[PDB]
Structures are given as structure tokens and as C-alpha cells.
Amino acid sequence: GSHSMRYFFTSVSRPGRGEPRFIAVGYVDDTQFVRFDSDAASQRMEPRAPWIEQEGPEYWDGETRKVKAHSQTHRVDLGTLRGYYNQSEAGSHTVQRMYGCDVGSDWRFLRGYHQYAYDGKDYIALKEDLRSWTAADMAAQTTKHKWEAAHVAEQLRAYLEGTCVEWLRRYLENGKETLQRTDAPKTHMTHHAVSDHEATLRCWALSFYPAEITLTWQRDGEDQTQDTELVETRPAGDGTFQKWAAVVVPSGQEQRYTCHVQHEGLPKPLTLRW
């Protein structure tokens, strides 16, 4: 299937003393594999998956250098944007960055991205064509002009089409044991009675990865969304994921309803019945 590599950065300004709180994490697909925290003692980029640990000291020197420099850009930006928006020095503010690359099943470049946010709203984003920018307001437009004059997009395009894809490929190979393994959901259904008239069927999907997955109900072979509930996908804590979907039914008619599970690790979707 398709894969991605994606970095996330959060900076939170600290009014009254000192530099922002800065947290960086890196993913391959739904697996975290790197981390920098400004509050941490090491002041290094640190491993968070086993396959990243066979990179040598030069890797961690390099990534530490870059991620610290990342951190300084963000610090500067928080000052800059505060000016842009004519805000006092009194409040805490946030910048957030993600960038990274998707590849398809053949591991070839499919797309990449570079998005930027201020206090939790769109600021500026690299467009799909990787040659142009989306700026959300006039502050963001000033940044756009800057980055247009400096040919930022070209630099990012080279990274996103080249080194991003190359190193994602390396990671996928190195971590094949787990990163190229799909874990189909372990599924079951449960039953719970509200009154004498009404029961709830709950469809469980446990211990699956990647996180992507579809649960649906049918009544008598037809999709039903009414009287259903679907929980956000949550992490199990061991690297896999959980989800459930429930429907309310008239007591005694349980047999009418079926739960349908799609996921990358099942060759054909599954069907469950009480």
C-alpha cells in the first residue's frame, strides 16, 4: 500500500522568561520514530523506534543540528508574527509545522506538503504543485512574498521529491519487520440491553495497523447510519489501534444487522453477525 514520512513541530511562546517550548516528532506511516523536546535534558534528537537505532552517530549529530535550527526559526517567527498581528508581548502563542511526503504502492513520489499554522489556524501552505503558496490572510501574504523572493518553494520541492522519498525508502527497508507488516483488526461483537425493547450492538476492531480502517453497519443488506455511533480511532499504546461502531436495534431483531470491516490487512472485507 501507500506510505508517508511526516514531521510535526510545535512551538509555544513563554511570556516572561526565555525561549519557547519546542517539540518535534517524526513518523513513518503511523509509527513514531524520532523526537526532540526542548525541555529534555539530552538536547538531542532521540530514537523512538528500534529500526532507527542502527543509524550511526553521524545521523544523530546531523538530525540534532537541523532540529535545533528548526527550533530557532520558530522562535524568530513567534516574534515576527506577533508584530504582524500587532499583539502584546503578554500572551502565549503557538506556531505549528508539518511537512513530509507520500509514496504509492510502488514507493514512487505521489505528493508532498509543507503547512504552517499560527494559534491553531491556517497561516501559509505549499500547494500541491510545490511551486506556489496558499496564504490565508495579509500577514501570511507578506511571508509569501518573502518566500517567493527567496525561492523557498524550489528548495522544498527538491527535498520533497528527492531526499524525503529516498530516506522514506531506506526507513521502510530497514524497518521491514514491522513497517511492511500489516496487522488486520481482530474483530468481535458485543451485546447490551437498554430496556425490554431496545439493545445495542457494538462492533469491535482491535490491535490493527495501519490506523486506516472503515466500519459500517447494514440492516438487511442495506447501509444504515441512523441510530449508529462511531468512536474516533484511538491508540492501544503498543503501536496498534482500536475502534468500535455501535447500532441501536429493537430487541429480538439482532440477526438483521451486520457489521462490515475494511482494512489493508484483510484481503476481503469481513462481515460480523450477532
Binding site: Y7, T80, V152
Partner: peptide
């Protein structure tokens, strides 16, 4: 690996 340089906004 990370991109090598971020220009200020």
C-alpha cells in the same frame, strides 16, 4: 531525515 534549513517567516 529532516529538511536542511527553514527560512524565517
Amino acid at each position: 531525515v529532516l529538511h536542511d534549513d527553514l527560512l524565517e517567516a
